[PDB]
Amino acid sequence: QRFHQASPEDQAEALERYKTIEPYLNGHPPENETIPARTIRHWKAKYLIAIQKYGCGYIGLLSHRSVKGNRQRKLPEDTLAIMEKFILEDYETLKQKRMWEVHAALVRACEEAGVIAPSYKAFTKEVQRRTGYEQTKK
Amino acid sequence: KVGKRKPKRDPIGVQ
Amino acid sequence: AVYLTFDSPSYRSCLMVLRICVKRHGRLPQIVVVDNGAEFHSVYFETLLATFECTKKQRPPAKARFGSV
Amino acid sequence: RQGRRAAYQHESFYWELAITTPRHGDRPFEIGHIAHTELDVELVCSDTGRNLGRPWATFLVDAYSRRLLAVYLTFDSPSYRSCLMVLRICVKRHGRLPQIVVVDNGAEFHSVYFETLLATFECTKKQRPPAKARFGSVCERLFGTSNTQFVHNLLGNTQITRNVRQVTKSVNPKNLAVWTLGLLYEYLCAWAYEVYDTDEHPALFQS
Amino acid sequence: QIRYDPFNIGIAYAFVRGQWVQCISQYYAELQGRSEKELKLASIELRKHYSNHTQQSKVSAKNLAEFLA
DNA sequence: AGTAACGGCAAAGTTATGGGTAAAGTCACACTACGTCTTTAATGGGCAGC
DNA sequence: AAAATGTGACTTTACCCATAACTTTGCCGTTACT
DNA sequence: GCTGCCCATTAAAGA
Ligand SMILES: [Mg+2]
């Protein structure tokens, strides 16, 4: 499962780690190594730990770059709720309103409510994330 | 309703 | 079967297409799939399909994918 | 392949080399364009509530400041009455009238009445060639803005009927329409006279 | 690929077919027959102009929102 | 006792993801879609027999 | 018998600022070996 | 005065 969490470029980077480590695990280190000592030591130690725990050391060299990244929302929650309400009740209607006018109404409502207003890019991005049956039917 | 044939069990097979 | 006529579809078009199908091959299809058009929800077509032991199937309204062929 | 109407998009742009007479005039009330369109909005009867259709909008707009000089709304097709009207309002709330009035090759403009009136008030009547729309382009796009800013944001708009193949009895604007001619005209005048009038223009850097 | 003269709206240069080729706008004919000293000042003036107008979309949106309300 | 290899601490870097503005890019304004044929069932007149 | 009007309102990229969630490094402590 | 019998027409929705 740890292997299946990784991506193709994770496969490539773990393979690069493996070809860096393998000469150290054969008693014939290369005479010209670009990788420094500490990095190769860490990779070899992780290889040893994985081969001593999971029965297969290559899984230790995985990076799993999908786990890293800021998946946290930056807008305040009140703005998110108000924009969701405006998209639901002023954009998904039998009027085919343009995004600019509904965004302007949302901004005016935000300014009356005292909440931080979003940008036009934010509105467009959250509208293109609600696309489908619901939007096309409303 | 409108133009809707009444529910019936038509005979089947060439008479 | 292929039939061509200037008139709007009605039981005459179904009559001609089924007669052509019988003439060219010899047998009507076992399950005839038709759309919810009023020309199929009539009294002539239903008894015509009943006479020749033809199971009639009706695609749901505004769902054309059921006739994707 | 398609014809001269479809090829007109890729026709050409006349690029000015020297300083000819400017395309959009030199001062207010110099070149004014007149054009009509069928507004995409259904209207019900004021009293009996029955649907009446899509009203026709007639716009006279100066080419210099883009200011919508006069706006008219009537259920009828293009006919002089249209023209008497837009020009009455022009000479009513503003004051005078254009100097060069472009007007496509309508019938309302090839008539004797409009030409006689323009002669009486000394307005140079200019006519774009048939099937060519860029010669009144500045006017015609002012229709599209009226669509986006005021018209398409109303109930019963005739927007979803562009895709005729996808129309149902639950979405037909003739069952959703609630506006009347008087109120629609009032709010269209409001938009053209104090909303679009105070909005900054890209081609002028001022309202 | 494109290059532009900060001292001249009327002029641009694009790479077409293997040729830095002159490109004409509108503030070219409209700015034809003047010196090279007022041309650059008018050029800078129109840059800020076309900018500053992009920024005032907020006020237009607010007025549109009030009218639509 | 000195030296090279191994490993912990930690900061430095790397993608990644949800925001912001500013400017390149799209496209509709160009008269115009709602309109017509087909279908069965019930009902309501005249017309006729008792 | 005929020259010489495209616009501009509303979107979509594109780049920058901030921070999470890890890899990538140096540097020093420790230890096997000579 | 009473009752039965074929013809027009209205009803909307789907292609
Ligand atoms: Mg229109």
Coordinates of C-alpha atoms (C1' of nucleotides) and ligand atoms in Angstrom, one line a residue:
Chain A
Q1 CA 0.0 0.0 0.0
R2 CA 2.9 2.4 0.7
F3 CA 4.2 1.6 -2.7
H4 CA 0.8 2.1 -4.3
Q5 CA 0.5 5.5 -2.7
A6 CA 3.5 6.8 -4.7
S7 CA 3.6 8.4 -8.2
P8 CA 5.7 7.6 -11.3
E9 CA 8.2 10.4 -10.6
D10 CA 8.3 9.0 -7.0
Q11 CA 9.2 5.7 -8.7
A12 CA 12.0 7.4 -10.7
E13 CA 13.4 9.2 -7.6
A14 CA 13.4 6.0 -5.5
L15 CA 15.1 4.2 -8.4
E16 CA 17.8 7.0 -8.4
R17 CA 18.2 6.5 -4.7
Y18 CA 18.6 2.7 -5.3
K19 CA 21.3 3.2 -7.9
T20 CA 23.1 5.6 -5.6
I21 CA 22.9 3.1 -2.7
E22 CA 23.6 -0.2 -4.5
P23 CA 27.4 0.4 -5.1
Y24 CA 27.7 1.1 -1.3
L25 CA 25.9 -2.2 -0.7
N26 CA 28.3 -4.1 -3.0
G27 CA 31.7 -3.2 -1.5
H28 CA 32.7 -1.2 -4.6
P29 CA 32.0 2.5 -4.1
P30 CA 32.4 4.7 -7.1
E31 CA 35.5 7.0 -7.3
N32 CA 33.3 10.0 -8.5
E33 CA 30.1 10.5 -6.6
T34 CA 28.1 13.7 -6.8
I35 CA 25.8 12.8 -3.9
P36 CA 27.5 13.8 -0.6
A37 CA 28.2 11.5 2.3
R38 CA 25.3 12.3 4.6
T39 CA 22.6 11.8 2.0
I40 CA 23.9 8.5 0.9
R41 CA 24.3 7.4 4.5
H42 CA 20.6 8.3 5.2
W43 CA 19.5 6.5 2.1
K44 CA 21.5 3.4 3.0
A45 CA 20.2 3.5 6.6
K46 CA 16.6 3.7 5.3
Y47 CA 17.3 0.8 2.9
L48 CA 18.6 -1.3 5.9
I49 CA 15.6 -0.4 8.1
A50 CA 13.1 -1.3 5.3
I51 CA 14.9 -4.5 4.5
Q52 CA 14.9 -5.4 8.2
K53 CA 11.2 -4.5 8.8
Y54 CA 9.1 -5.0 5.7
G55 CA 11.2 -7.6 4.0
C56 CA 11.9 -5.3 1.0
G57 CA 14.1 -2.3 1.3
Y58 CA 13.1 -0.4 -1.8
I59 CA 9.9 0.8 0.0
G60 CA 12.1 2.8 2.3
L61 CA 13.3 4.9 -0.6
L62 CA 9.8 6.2 -1.5
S63 CA 9.1 9.9 -1.1
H64 CA 5.3 10.1 -1.5
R65 CA 5.3 13.7 -2.7
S66 CA 1.5 13.7 -2.7
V67 CA 1.4 13.8 1.1
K68 CA 3.2 17.2 1.1
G69 CA 1.5 20.4 0.1
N70 CA -0.8 23.0 1.7
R71 CA -4.3 21.5 1.3
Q72 CA -5.7 24.0 3.8
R73 CA -8.1 26.7 2.7
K74 CA -6.9 30.3 2.8
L75 CA -10.1 32.2 2.8
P76 CA -12.1 32.6 6.0
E77 CA -14.9 30.2 6.6
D78 CA -17.6 33.0 6.6
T79 CA -16.5 34.1 3.1
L80 CA -16.6 30.5 2.0
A81 CA -20.1 30.0 3.3
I82 CA -21.4 33.3 1.8
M83 CA -19.8 32.4 -1.6
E84 CA -21.4 29.0 -1.5
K85 CA -24.8 30.5 -0.7
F86 CA -24.4 33.0 -3.5
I87 CA -23.4 30.3 -6.0
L88 CA -26.3 28.2 -5.0
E89 CA -29.0 30.9 -4.9
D90 CA -27.8 33.5 -7.4
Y91 CA -25.8 31.5 -10.0
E92 CA -27.6 28.2 -10.2
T93 CA -30.9 29.8 -11.3
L94 CA -33.1 29.9 -14.4
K95 CA -31.5 33.2 -15.4
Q96 CA -28.0 32.3 -16.7
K97 CA -26.4 35.2 -14.9
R98 CA -22.8 36.1 -15.8
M99 CA -20.1 35.5 -13.3
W100 CA -19.2 39.2 -13.0
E101 CA -22.7 40.4 -11.8
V102 CA -23.1 37.6 -9.3
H103 CA -19.6 38.3 -8.0
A104 CA -20.5 42.0 -7.7
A105 CA -23.6 41.1 -5.7
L106 CA -21.6 38.8 -3.5
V107 CA -19.0 41.5 -2.9
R108 CA -21.7 44.0 -1.9
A109 CA -23.3 41.5 0.5
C110 CA -19.9 40.8 2.0
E111 CA -19.3 44.5 2.5
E112 CA -22.6 44.8 4.2
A113 CA -21.9 41.7 6.3
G114 CA -18.4 42.9 7.2
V115 CA -16.7 39.8 6.0
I116 CA -13.5 39.6 3.9
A117 CA -14.6 39.6 0.2
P118 CA -13.1 37.1 -2.2
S119 CA -11.6 37.8 -5.6
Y120 CA -13.1 37.1 -9.1
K121 CA -10.6 34.3 -9.5
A122 CA -11.8 32.7 -6.3
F123 CA -15.4 32.8 -7.5
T124 CA -14.5 31.4 -10.9
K125 CA -12.4 28.6 -9.4
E126 CA -15.1 27.6 -6.9
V127 CA -17.8 27.7 -9.7
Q128 CA -15.7 25.5 -12.0
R129 CA -15.5 23.1 -9.0
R130 CA -19.3 22.8 -8.7
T131 CA -19.8 22.0 -12.3
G132 CA -22.0 19.1 -13.4
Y133 CA -25.6 17.9 -13.3
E134 CA -26.5 20.4 -10.6
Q135 CA -25.2 23.5 -12.3
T136 CA -26.4 22.5 -15.8
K137 CA -29.9 21.7 -14.5
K138 CA -30.3 24.8 -12.3
Chain B
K1 CA -54.4 11.3 -20.5
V2 CA -54.0 12.9 -24.0
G3 CA -53.8 10.5 -26.9
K4 CA -53.1 7.7 -24.4
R5 CA -54.4 4.3 -25.4
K6 CA -56.5 2.7 -22.7
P7 CA -54.9 -0.2 -20.7
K8 CA -55.8 -3.4 -22.5
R9 CA -54.5 -6.9 -23.1
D10 CA -54.4 -7.2 -26.9
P11 CA -54.5 -10.7 -28.5
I12 CA -51.2 -12.0 -29.8
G13 CA -50.8 -14.2 -32.8
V14 CA -52.1 -14.0 -36.3
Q15 CA -55.8 -14.9 -36.3
Chain C
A1 CA -35.1 -1.2 -43.2
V2 CA -34.9 2.3 -44.7
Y3 CA -38.0 4.3 -45.7
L4 CA -38.3 7.9 -47.0
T5 CA -41.5 10.0 -47.2
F6 CA -42.3 13.7 -47.1
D7 CA -45.1 13.3 -44.5
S8 CA -44.5 13.7 -40.8
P9 CA -43.9 10.4 -38.9
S10 CA -47.1 8.5 -38.1
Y11 CA -48.3 4.9 -38.2
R12 CA -47.9 4.9 -42.0
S13 CA -44.1 5.2 -41.6
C14 CA -44.0 2.4 -39.1
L15 CA -46.2 0.3 -41.4
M16 CA -43.9 0.9 -44.4
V17 CA -40.7 0.3 -42.4
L18 CA -42.0 -3.0 -40.9
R19 CA -43.3 -4.2 -44.3
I20 CA -39.9 -3.4 -45.9
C21 CA -38.2 -5.3 -43.0
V22 CA -40.4 -8.3 -43.6
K23 CA -39.9 -8.2 -47.4
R24 CA -36.1 -7.9 -47.4
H25 CA -35.4 -10.5 -44.7
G26 CA -38.6 -12.3 -43.7
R27 CA -38.9 -11.8 -40.0
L28 CA -39.6 -8.8 -37.7
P29 CA -37.1 -8.2 -34.8
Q30 CA -38.0 -10.0 -31.6
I31 CA -37.7 -6.9 -29.4
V32 CA -38.6 -3.6 -31.1
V33 CA -37.2 -0.6 -29.2
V34 CA -39.1 2.6 -30.0
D35 CA -39.2 6.1 -28.6
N36 CA -42.0 7.7 -26.6
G37 CA -43.4 9.5 -29.8
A38 CA -47.1 9.5 -30.2
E39 CA -46.8 7.5 -33.4
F40 CA -45.6 4.6 -31.4
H41 CA -48.0 5.0 -28.4
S42 CA -50.9 4.4 -30.8
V43 CA -53.4 1.5 -31.3
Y44 CA -52.1 0.4 -34.7
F45 CA -48.5 -0.1 -33.9
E46 CA -49.2 -1.9 -30.6
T47 CA -51.6 -4.4 -32.1
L48 CA -49.2 -4.8 -35.1
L49 CA -46.3 -5.7 -32.8
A50 CA -48.7 -8.0 -30.7
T51 CA -49.8 -9.9 -33.8
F52 CA -46.2 -11.0 -34.7
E53 CA -45.1 -11.8 -31.1
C54 CA -42.8 -8.7 -30.9
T55 CA -41.8 -7.4 -27.4
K56 CA -42.1 -3.7 -27.5
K57 CA -39.6 -1.6 -25.5
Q58 CA -40.1 2.1 -24.7
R59 CA -37.1 4.3 -24.0
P60 CA -37.7 6.9 -21.2
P61 CA -38.6 10.5 -22.3
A62 CA -35.7 12.8 -23.1
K63 CA -33.2 9.9 -22.9
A64 CA -31.9 9.3 -26.4
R65 CA -28.9 7.2 -25.3
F66 CA -31.2 4.2 -25.2
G67 CA -31.2 4.4 -29.0
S68 CA -27.5 5.0 -29.3
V69 CA -27.1 2.5 -32.2
Chain D
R1 CA -17.9 27.1 -48.4
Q2 CA -20.4 28.8 -46.1
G3 CA -21.0 32.1 -47.8
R4 CA -20.3 35.9 -47.7
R5 CA -22.1 36.3 -44.4
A6 CA -20.0 33.7 -42.5
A7 CA -16.7 34.8 -44.1
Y8 CA -17.3 38.4 -42.8
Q9 CA -15.6 37.5 -39.5
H10 CA -12.2 37.0 -41.2
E11 CA -12.8 39.7 -43.8
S12 CA -10.2 42.5 -43.0
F13 CA -9.4 45.4 -40.7
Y14 CA -8.9 48.8 -42.3
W15 CA -5.8 50.0 -40.5
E16 CA -5.3 53.8 -40.6
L17 CA -1.9 54.9 -41.9
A18 CA -2.4 58.7 -41.9
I19 CA -4.8 61.0 -40.0
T20 CA -8.0 60.6 -42.0
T21 CA -11.3 61.7 -40.4
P22 CA -11.5 59.8 -37.1
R23 CA -13.6 56.7 -37.0
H24 CA -15.5 57.7 -33.9
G25 CA -15.7 61.4 -34.5
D26 CA -14.0 64.4 -32.9
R27 CA -16.6 65.8 -30.5
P28 CA -20.0 65.0 -28.9
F29 CA -23.0 65.1 -31.3
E30 CA -20.9 64.5 -34.5
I31 CA -21.5 60.8 -35.5
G32 CA -24.5 59.0 -34.0
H33 CA -25.5 55.4 -34.9
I34 CA -29.0 54.2 -35.0
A35 CA -29.8 50.4 -34.6
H36 CA -32.6 48.2 -33.5
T37 CA -32.6 44.7 -31.9
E38 CA -35.1 42.2 -30.5
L39 CA -34.5 42.2 -26.7
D40 CA -34.2 38.7 -25.3
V41 CA -36.9 39.0 -22.6
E42 CA -40.5 37.8 -22.5
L43 CA -43.2 40.2 -21.3
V44 CA -46.6 39.5 -19.9
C45 CA -49.6 41.8 -20.3
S46 CA -49.9 44.5 -17.6
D47 CA -53.5 43.8 -16.9
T48 CA -54.5 40.3 -18.2
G49 CA -51.1 38.7 -17.6
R50 CA -50.8 36.9 -20.9
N51 CA -47.5 36.7 -22.6
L52 CA -46.8 39.3 -25.3
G53 CA -43.4 38.3 -26.6
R54 CA -40.0 40.0 -26.9
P55 CA -39.9 43.8 -27.2
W56 CA -37.8 45.6 -29.7
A57 CA -35.1 48.0 -28.5
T58 CA -34.0 51.0 -30.7
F59 CA -30.7 52.7 -29.7
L60 CA -29.3 56.0 -30.9
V61 CA -25.8 56.3 -29.5
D62 CA -23.1 58.9 -30.3
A63 CA -19.8 57.4 -31.5
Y64 CA -17.5 59.8 -29.6
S65 CA -18.4 59.4 -25.9
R66 CA -20.4 56.1 -26.4
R67 CA -23.2 57.7 -24.3
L68 CA -26.5 56.1 -25.1
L69 CA -28.2 59.1 -26.6
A70 CA -31.8 57.7 -26.8
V71 CA -33.3 54.4 -26.0
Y72 CA -36.8 53.2 -27.1
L73 CA -38.8 50.0 -26.5
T74 CA -41.8 48.9 -28.6
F75 CA -43.5 45.6 -29.4
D76 CA -43.7 46.4 -33.1
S77 CA -41.3 45.7 -35.8
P78 CA -38.9 48.3 -37.3
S79 CA -41.1 51.1 -38.6
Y80 CA -40.7 54.9 -38.6
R81 CA -42.6 55.3 -35.5
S82 CA -39.5 53.8 -34.0
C83 CA -37.5 56.5 -35.6
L84 CA -39.7 59.4 -34.7
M85 CA -39.5 58.3 -31.2
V86 CA -35.8 57.8 -30.5
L87 CA -35.3 61.2 -32.2
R88 CA -38.0 62.8 -30.1
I89 CA -36.3 61.8 -27.0
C90 CA -33.0 62.8 -28.3
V91 CA -34.3 66.2 -29.0
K92 CA -36.0 66.2 -25.7
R93 CA -33.9 65.3 -22.8
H94 CA -30.6 66.2 -24.5
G95 CA -31.2 69.0 -26.9
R96 CA -30.5 68.6 -30.6
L97 CA -29.4 65.9 -32.7
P98 CA -26.5 64.3 -34.5
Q99 CA -24.6 65.6 -37.5
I100 CA -23.9 62.4 -39.2
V101 CA -26.3 59.6 -38.5
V102 CA -25.3 56.2 -39.7
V103 CA -28.2 53.9 -40.2
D104 CA -28.1 50.5 -41.9
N105 CA -29.9 49.6 -44.9
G106 CA -33.3 49.2 -43.3
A107 CA -36.6 50.1 -44.7
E108 CA -37.2 52.4 -42.0
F109 CA -34.3 54.3 -43.3
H110 CA -34.9 54.0 -47.1
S111 CA -38.4 55.4 -46.4
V112 CA -39.3 59.0 -47.4
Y113 CA -40.3 60.1 -43.9
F114 CA -36.9 59.6 -42.2
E115 CA -34.9 61.1 -45.1
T116 CA -37.3 64.1 -45.2
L117 CA -36.9 64.6 -41.5
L118 CA -33.1 64.4 -41.6
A119 CA -33.1 66.9 -44.5
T120 CA -35.3 69.2 -42.5
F121 CA -33.0 69.1 -39.4
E122 CA -29.9 69.0 -41.6
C123 CA -28.3 65.7 -40.5
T124 CA -26.0 63.9 -42.9
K125 CA -27.5 60.5 -43.5
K126 CA -24.8 57.8 -43.8
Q127 CA -25.6 54.2 -44.8
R128 CA -23.4 51.1 -44.2
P129 CA -23.3 48.5 -47.0
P130 CA -25.6 45.5 -46.8
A131 CA -24.5 42.6 -44.6
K132 CA -21.7 44.7 -43.1
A133 CA -21.9 45.3 -39.4
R134 CA -18.6 46.8 -38.4
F135 CA -19.6 50.2 -39.8
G136 CA -22.0 50.5 -36.9
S137 CA -19.9 48.2 -34.7
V138 CA -19.7 50.7 -31.8
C139 CA -23.5 50.8 -31.6
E140 CA -24.1 47.1 -32.1
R141 CA -21.8 45.9 -29.2
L142 CA -23.8 48.3 -27.0
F143 CA -26.6 45.8 -27.5
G144 CA -24.4 42.9 -26.1
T145 CA -23.5 44.9 -23.0
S146 CA -27.2 45.6 -22.4
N147 CA -27.6 41.8 -22.6
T148 CA -25.0 41.1 -19.9
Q149 CA -25.6 44.0 -17.5
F150 CA -29.3 44.3 -17.5
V151 CA -31.3 41.9 -19.8
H152 CA -29.8 38.5 -19.2
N153 CA -30.1 39.1 -15.4
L154 CA -34.0 39.0 -15.6
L155 CA -36.6 36.3 -15.5
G156 CA -38.0 35.0 -18.8
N157 CA -34.9 36.1 -20.8
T158 CA -34.6 34.6 -24.2
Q159 CA -31.1 33.3 -23.6
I160 CA -31.6 29.5 -23.3
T161 CA -33.7 29.5 -26.5
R162 CA -30.4 29.9 -28.6
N163 CA -30.2 26.1 -28.0
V164 CA -33.7 25.3 -29.3
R165 CA -33.0 21.6 -29.3
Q166 CA -32.7 21.8 -25.4
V167 CA -35.9 23.5 -24.3
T168 CA -38.6 22.0 -22.1
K169 CA -41.9 23.2 -20.7
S170 CA -40.3 23.7 -17.3
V171 CA -37.7 26.2 -18.7
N172 CA -39.8 28.0 -21.3
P173 CA -39.5 31.8 -20.5
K174 CA -43.2 32.3 -21.6
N175 CA -44.1 30.6 -18.3
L176 CA -41.5 32.3 -16.2
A177 CA -41.9 35.8 -17.6
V178 CA -43.2 38.4 -15.1
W179 CA -41.9 41.8 -16.4
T180 CA -44.0 44.4 -18.2
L181 CA -43.1 46.8 -21.0
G182 CA -43.3 49.9 -18.8
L183 CA -41.1 48.6 -16.0
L184 CA -38.6 47.0 -18.4
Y185 CA -38.3 50.3 -20.3
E186 CA -38.0 52.3 -17.0
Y187 CA -35.1 50.1 -15.8
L188 CA -33.5 50.0 -19.2
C189 CA -33.5 53.8 -19.2
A190 CA -32.1 53.8 -15.7
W191 CA -29.2 51.6 -16.8
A192 CA -28.5 53.6 -19.9
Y193 CA -28.8 57.0 -18.2
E194 CA -27.2 56.6 -14.8
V195 CA -25.5 53.2 -14.6
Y196 CA -23.6 52.9 -17.9
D197 CA -23.4 56.7 -18.0
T198 CA -21.2 56.9 -14.9
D199 CA -19.1 53.8 -15.8
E200 CA -15.6 54.4 -17.1
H201 CA -15.0 53.4 -20.7
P202 CA -11.8 51.6 -21.9
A203 CA -11.7 53.8 -25.0
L204 CA -12.1 57.1 -23.2
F205 CA -10.6 56.6 -19.6
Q206 CA -13.7 58.5 -18.4
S207 CA -17.4 58.0 -18.0
Chain E
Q1 CA 8.1 37.0 -29.9
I2 CA 7.4 40.7 -29.4
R3 CA 9.3 43.8 -28.5
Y4 CA 7.8 47.2 -27.6
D5 CA 9.0 50.8 -27.4
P6 CA 8.1 52.5 -24.0
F7 CA 8.6 55.8 -25.9
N8 CA 6.1 54.9 -28.6
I9 CA 2.6 53.2 -28.5
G10 CA 2.4 53.4 -32.3
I11 CA 5.3 51.0 -32.8
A12 CA 5.8 47.3 -32.0
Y13 CA 8.1 44.6 -33.3
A14 CA 7.2 40.9 -33.8
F15 CA 9.2 37.9 -35.0
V16 CA 7.4 36.5 -38.1
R17 CA 9.0 34.1 -40.5
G18 CA 12.5 35.1 -39.4
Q19 CA 12.1 38.9 -39.5
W20 CA 11.8 41.5 -36.8
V21 CA 8.7 43.1 -38.4
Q22 CA 7.2 46.5 -37.6
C23 CA 3.7 46.4 -36.1
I24 CA 1.2 49.3 -36.2
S25 CA -1.4 50.1 -33.7
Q26 CA -3.8 53.1 -33.7
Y27 CA -2.0 55.6 -31.6
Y28 CA 0.3 55.6 -34.6
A29 CA -1.7 57.1 -37.2
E30 CA -3.4 59.1 -34.5
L31 CA 0.1 60.2 -33.3
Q32 CA 1.6 60.7 -36.8
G33 CA 3.2 64.0 -37.6
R34 CA 4.5 64.9 -34.1
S35 CA 8.0 65.1 -32.7
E36 CA 9.8 62.3 -30.8
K37 CA 9.8 64.2 -27.5
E38 CA 6.0 64.6 -27.0
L39 CA 5.5 61.2 -28.6
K40 CA 7.2 59.5 -25.7
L41 CA 5.4 61.6 -23.0
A42 CA 2.1 60.7 -24.6
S43 CA 3.3 57.1 -24.8
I44 CA 4.0 56.9 -21.0
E45 CA 0.7 58.7 -20.4
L46 CA -1.2 56.1 -22.3
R47 CA 0.5 53.2 -20.4
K48 CA -0.7 54.3 -17.1
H49 CA -3.9 55.1 -18.7
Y50 CA -4.6 51.7 -19.9
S51 CA -3.5 50.4 -16.6
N52 CA -5.4 52.5 -14.2
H53 CA -8.5 51.7 -16.2
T54 CA -8.1 48.0 -15.6
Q55 CA -8.0 48.7 -11.8
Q56 CA -11.4 50.6 -11.7
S57 CA -13.4 47.4 -12.4
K58 CA -14.3 47.3 -8.7
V59 CA -16.3 50.6 -8.9
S60 CA -18.1 49.4 -12.1
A61 CA -18.9 46.1 -10.4
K62 CA -20.2 47.9 -7.3
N63 CA -22.5 50.2 -9.3
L64 CA -23.7 47.2 -11.4
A65 CA -24.4 45.3 -8.1
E66 CA -26.4 48.2 -6.7
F67 CA -28.4 48.6 -9.9
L68 CA -29.0 44.8 -10.1
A69 CA -30.1 44.7 -6.4
Chain F
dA1 C1' 45.3 7.9 20.8
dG2 C1' 44.3 9.4 15.6
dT3 C1' 41.2 8.6 11.6
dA4 C1' 37.3 7.2 8.6
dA5 C1' 32.5 5.5 8.6
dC6 C1' 27.8 5.7 10.7
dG7 C1' 23.9 8.3 12.6
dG8 C1' 21.2 12.1 15.2
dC9 C1' 19.9 17.6 15.0
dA10 C1' 18.5 20.9 12.5
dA11 C1' 18.0 24.3 8.8
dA12 C1' 17.4 24.6 3.9
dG13 C1' 15.2 23.2 -0.1
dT14 C1' 11.4 21.1 -2.7
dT15 C1' 6.9 20.4 -4.4
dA16 C1' 2.3 21.3 -3.5
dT17 C1' -2.0 23.9 -2.7
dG18 C1' -5.2 27.6 -1.9
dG19 C1' -5.1 32.8 -2.2
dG20 C1' -3.9 37.9 -4.5
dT21 C1' -3.5 41.2 -8.8
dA22 C1' -2.5 42.3 -13.5
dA23 C1' -2.9 41.4 -18.3
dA24 C1' -3.5 38.4 -22.4
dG25 C1' -7.7 35.9 -24.6
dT26 C1' -12.9 34.9 -26.0
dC27 C1' -16.6 36.0 -28.1
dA28 C1' -21.2 38.0 -29.0
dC29 C1' -23.3 42.6 -30.7
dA30 C1' -24.2 42.1 -35.5
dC31 C1' -33.6 41.0 -36.9
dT32 C1' -34.8 36.1 -35.4
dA33 C1' -36.8 30.3 -33.0
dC34 C1' -40.4 28.3 -30.5
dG35 C1' -43.3 25.9 -34.2
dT36 C1' -45.9 21.8 -36.3
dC37 C1' -47.8 17.0 -36.9
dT38 C1' -49.6 13.1 -34.5
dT39 C1' -52.3 10.5 -31.0
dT40 C1' -56.6 8.3 -28.3
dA41 C1' -60.6 9.2 -25.2
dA42 C1' -64.7 11.8 -23.8
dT43 C1' -68.2 14.7 -24.8
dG44 C1' -71.7 17.2 -27.1
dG45 C1' -74.6 18.5 -30.7
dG46 C1' -78.2 16.7 -34.4
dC47 C1' -80.9 12.7 -36.1
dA48 C1' -83.7 8.9 -35.8
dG49 C1' -86.7 5.2 -33.6
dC50 C1' -90.1 4.1 -29.8
Chain G
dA1 C1' -22.2 52.3 -59.9
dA2 C1' -19.5 51.8 -56.1
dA3 C1' -14.0 52.0 -50.9
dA4 C1' -11.7 52.0 -46.4
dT5 C1' -15.7 50.9 -39.1
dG6 C1' -14.4 46.6 -35.0
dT7 C1' -15.6 46.7 -30.0
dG8 C1' -15.3 46.0 -24.9
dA9 C1' -17.5 43.0 -21.0
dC10 C1' -16.7 39.3 -19.1
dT11 C1' -13.2 35.3 -18.5
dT12 C1' -8.7 32.8 -18.2
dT13 C1' -3.8 32.4 -17.7
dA14 C1' 0.2 33.6 -15.5
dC15 C1' 3.2 35.0 -11.9
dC16 C1' 3.9 36.1 -6.9
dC17 C1' 3.3 35.5 -1.3
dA18 C1' 2.5 32.2 2.4
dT19 C1' 2.8 27.9 4.6
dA20 C1' 2.4 22.6 5.2
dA21 C1' 4.9 18.2 4.7
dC22 C1' 8.2 16.2 3.9
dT23 C1' 13.6 15.2 1.4
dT24 C1' 18.4 17.1 1.4
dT25 C1' 22.1 18.6 3.1
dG26 C1' 26.3 20.1 6.7
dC27 C1' 28.2 19.3 11.2
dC28 C1' 29.3 17.2 15.3
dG29 C1' 29.1 13.1 18.5
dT30 C1' 30.2 8.3 18.7
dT31 C1' 32.6 4.1 17.7
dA32 C1' 35.4 0.3 15.1
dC33 C1' 40.0 0.0 13.6
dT34 C1' 44.8 0.7 13.3
Chain H
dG1 C1' -91.9 13.4 -24.9
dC2 C1' -88.1 9.8 -24.0
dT3 C1' -83.8 7.3 -25.4
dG4 C1' -80.0 5.2 -28.5
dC5 C1' -76.6 6.2 -32.5
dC6 C1' -72.7 7.6 -35.4
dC7 C1' -69.9 12.3 -36.5
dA8 C1' -66.6 16.9 -34.8
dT9 C1' -63.9 18.8 -31.3
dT10 C1' -61.2 19.7 -27.3
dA11 C1' -57.2 18.0 -24.2
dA12 C1' -51.6 18.1 -24.1
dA13 C1' -47.1 16.3 -24.9
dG14 C1' -43.4 14.2 -27.5
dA15 C1' -40.6 13.9 -31.8
Ligands
MG1 MG -30.5 41.0 -28.5

